[PDB]
Design a protein around this ligand. Structure first.
Ligand SMILES: Nc1ncnc2c1ncn2[C@@H]1O[C@H](COP(=O)(O)OP(=O)(O)OP(=O)(O)O)[C@@H](O)[C@H]1O
Ligand SMILES: Nc1ncnc2c1ncn2[C@@H]1O[C@H](COP(=O)(O)OP(=O)(O)OP(=O)(O)O)[C@@H](O)[C@H]1O
Lengths: 302, 302
């Protein structure tokens, strides 16, 4: 029903605060925006699959197992015999969070052969990554997939901009992103990204819907000429790490379930799911359907 | 006086038992045989340098700093503007130790332009690993360097066989190892490595001295046809992880200090350093000079 295609990797999360240079301990967890959204969609009660590529190693097996536990279809996840599973060391704490991502990994080495078309086509909504586009052959491969299915399925794109991933090739970045946006019916981006990109002559807009996140403050929806600000519900945030992908998961589930872009319904659903997710720890903080039924906002969609 | 050239990387050590797939926590430490030996040499009171390459990232800075605290000369460690610092996830525990090494990293990307010849000009002994030979351009860069210095500095080679690093290129492995051995005045290898290579038709012996390790049973020193068996000191091992590199550091310092090749003195000094290193944890377990003066076998050499 809903399929995601993009980076699937291991997050080595710093246990203590400090620069990556000084951090002594790391805790491993499954990561990758597309995979995080795929799990969120699954927890919302919607069948979901992930098309990605991991290495034929212990980390690869771990990721497939963890996704399997969340009920995400992994049949579309290929194992690479040359490249090892993706990894990124992260420091989520402090005033200036940082990361060290290793790019010669399996998810950046996808080829058309690696794509399971039966799955990408059965889906009503196809969500693809921005990070996955920083390196070929995955870039070419993904752009080819999105262009091919366009029109047959709704396309969703989260800008999720990472400048460090395009150093020395920013021009190409502008092209790839602009091209991606133009293919997406549903586009998600933080206000910062929106600003940074328009300042490059790039319009951050989805042909069907645009969702601009405004941090803990809230989000904003744009339908044609209609602009709606949605303040965030009150919560005593435990961890907002997964808020972005939880928000995206809810947004794609809401669109799927609600015939007619009722931004009021949709807006309330995403706000609810995103806010509540700040109660869970980690990259997969999307609340389960069984927990959202108590709310009228969710009952509408779910 | 003593220079090491080879791999320098971050060891992500599993804090708990289990397959890497299930390990949750990893503790980061400096690793790499040549780096480990350089530290051991420095601790024994001899000035040592390391020629290697790390990425221009937090982990690269970490490694350079840790080596500097050990007084190892780091001028010969270059920063790669593209490739990231080497990393290896390791499970040292259990009966079946395992690891996951990422190969497209800085130390495997060394070119002749990365070689600080001055540091190489000073060295009376140059130590290099076989792991660094696993990939080009570093393999050719290292082979060329050692070939040029041959006859000006004593050459030391620790076979340190890691078959997983040569899958698909085992024939080449046999050729490079043999070339490296024939280029070395000093060769170190485990009995297991000696048998594997002899069976491959390769003779494991240095032109000046050969040290065959028998693990906890001690080692064997060989010059020409004069053999000297050195049984292990009687100790209760706490951690043998760094014993090999501690042994190599002692062997080189001994050769540098002791007038002739008195195998008895050399054997006693190396044995003492190795045994005591088993009392310290981690890859850098070589005892410091200050902790050795109270030993007769050490006073001579030191
Ligand atoms: N403390 C909070 N209380 C209520 N809702 C929140 C809170 N934090 C985040 N949210 C909701 O989740 C959405 C996610 O916001 P966040 O600041 O994580 O941006 P994002 O879209 O994840 O950006 P990025 O791509 O940089 O991670 C917000 O727009 C907001 O509505
Ligand atoms: N239990 C022990 N008691 C005393 N000495 C030991 C013990 N274990 C190792 N050693 C000393 O340290 C030296 C290092 O040998 P070790 O068995 O660690 O192999 P190695 O040369 O390090 O190879 P590898 O890379 O496979 O570890 C030995 O030759 C020995 O003298």
């Amino acid at each position: 029903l809903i399929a995601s295609i993009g980076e699937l990797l291991i997050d080595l999360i710093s246990v203590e605060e400090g620069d990556l240079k000084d951090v002594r301990l790391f805790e491993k967890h499954p990561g990758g925006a597309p995979a995080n959204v795929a799990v969120g969609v699954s927890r919302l009660g919607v069948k979901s699959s992930l098309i990605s590529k991991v290495g034929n190693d212990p980390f690869g097996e771990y990721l497939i197992e963890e996704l399997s536990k969340e009920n995400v279809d992994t049949r579309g996840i290929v194992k690479d015999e040359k490249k090892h599973t993706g990894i990124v060391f992260v420091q989520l704490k402090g005033a200036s969070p940082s990361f060290l991502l290793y790019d010669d990994v399996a998810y950046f080495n996808m080829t058309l052969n690696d794509i399971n078309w039966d799955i990408v086509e059965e889906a009503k909504i196809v969500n693809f990554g921005s990070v996955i586009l920083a390196r070929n052959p995955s870039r070419e491969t993904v752009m080819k997939v999105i262009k091919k299915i366009k029109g047959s399925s709704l396309i969703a794109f989260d800008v999720n901009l990472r400048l460090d991933l395009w150093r020395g090739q920013e021009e190409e970045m502008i092209k790839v992103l602009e091209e991606s946006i133009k293919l997406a019916d549903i586009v998600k981006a933080s206000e910062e990204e929106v600003l940074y990109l328009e300042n490059q002559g790039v319009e951050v807009k989805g042909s069907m819907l645009t969702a601009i996140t405004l941090g803990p403050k809230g989000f904003r929806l744009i339908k044609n000429e209609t602009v709606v600000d949605v303040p965030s519900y009150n919560v005593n945030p435990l961890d907002t790490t997964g808020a972005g992908d939880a928000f995206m998961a809810a947004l794609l589930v809401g669109i799927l379930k609600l015939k007619g872009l009722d931004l009021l319904k949709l807006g309330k659903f995403a706000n609810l799911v995103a806010a509540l997710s700040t109660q869970k720890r980690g990259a997969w903080s999307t609340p389960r359907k069984d927990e959202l039924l108590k709310y009228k906002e969710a009952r509408e969609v779910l």
